[PDB]
């Protein structure tokens, strides 16, 4: 696992302001990035040319909070209260 | 686990927004992995095969 999985890359960007092309250096994963033409020292982001990459804000979280699907009025959600249920077929211990 | 102790680096593309990245790696450089008891796992595979059969 020493093919260059972590890569140290440089690039010029315009800042908050259009009066500064700051040559910045950052780190990338070998999968997250893809080379161009001959393998020079040059790469490009894995899907930059073909997609719209959006940095998920760090303020948010992907934690899997459990969830219940509460049913509306005049409707009902039933349950198979069996131990070993096939998945398809008739139930026996059923409840609302 | 991802064993690496990483450092946040906010490069501000702006105006009121920045792109965060790993500034550096504090310590050794290591590989991410997942540990599971092979006894538990393959004794679990025993559970499966009999109900697969």
């Amino acid at each position: 696992m020493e093919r260059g999985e972590i890569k140290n890359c440089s690039f010029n960007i315009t800042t908050s302001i259009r009066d500064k092309v700051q040559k910045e250096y950052a780190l990338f994963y070998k999968l997250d990035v893809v080379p161009i033409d001959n393998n020079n020292t040059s790469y490009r982001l894995i899907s930059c040319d073909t997609s719209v990459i959006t940095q998920a804000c760090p303020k948010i979280s992907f934690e899997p909070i459990p969830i219940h699907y509460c049913a509306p009025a005049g409707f009902a959600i039933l349950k198979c209260n069996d131990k070993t249920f096939n998945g398809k077929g008739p139930c026996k211990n059923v409840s609302t | 686990t991802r064993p690496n102790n990483n450092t946040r680096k906010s490069i501000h593309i702006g105006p009121g927004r920045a792109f965060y990245t790993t500034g550096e790696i504090i310590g050794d450089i290591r590989q991410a992995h997942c540990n599971i008891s092979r006894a538990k796992w393959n004794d679990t595979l025993k559970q499966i095969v009999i109900k697969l059969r």
């Epitope: 696992m1 020493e2 | 064993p3 310590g27 050794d28 450089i29 290591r30 590989q31």
Partner: antibody, heavy 132, light 108 residues
Framework: QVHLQESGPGLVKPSETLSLTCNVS????????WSWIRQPLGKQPEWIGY???????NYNPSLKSRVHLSLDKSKNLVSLRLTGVTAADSAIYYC??????????????????????????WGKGTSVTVSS | APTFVSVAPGQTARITCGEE??????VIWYQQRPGQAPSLIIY??????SGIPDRFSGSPGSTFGTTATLTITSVEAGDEADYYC????????????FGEGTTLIVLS
Amino acid sequence: QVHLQESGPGLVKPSETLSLTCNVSGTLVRDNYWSWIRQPLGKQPEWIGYVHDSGDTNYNPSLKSRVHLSLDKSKNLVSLRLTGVTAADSAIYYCATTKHGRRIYGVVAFKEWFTYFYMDVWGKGTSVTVSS
Amino acid sequence: APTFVSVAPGQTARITCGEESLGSRSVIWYQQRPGQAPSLIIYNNNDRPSGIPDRFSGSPGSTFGTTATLTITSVEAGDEADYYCHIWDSRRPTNWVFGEGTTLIVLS
């Protein structure tokens, strides 16, 4: 009791090969990993390279093109041969056993360890001069 | 490094060496009495071979952003020498030339 001593010519013109030797006593020459070291007057010691019976033999990257090491079961010594010498090569050259260790920091399964050497007991020192 | 700390007998000497750490290092130490072969002092970072007392101790190669510090406790006369490092870092490649000859000198 275990100890050793090395020998040399003392002086060498800029051309030709600097050949050395290193007697061994108390322990066998095969069993140990051997390493030659040189140090100019005042300057810091400089690792030159190491060697084991199998021919497992790597050198300092700088002097790599010049240095040529070897052993011998009969004479039981450490035979260094530095070719194409220079004024800079004037130094005192030590002979020393080497002990090795594992330094596992991550997971042994996929490298994540480095192997380091240390030389436990040195010789006396052999002087070298490189003058016209 | 043309450096030399001066200490009094029965006092403590902090003799540092090498550049700052990156990964887990293993730093072997050496002592050089004037005109004598350098006796080995410590391996990897704090353990020592036969003959070296408990006065000697070193920086645990397990922290990052720290130089190699060799402590000589309650120093005496014979401890005077030129001390060196053989630095083995996880991220920085092999050191074939030794560290700086930090020269410890007693004061009394």
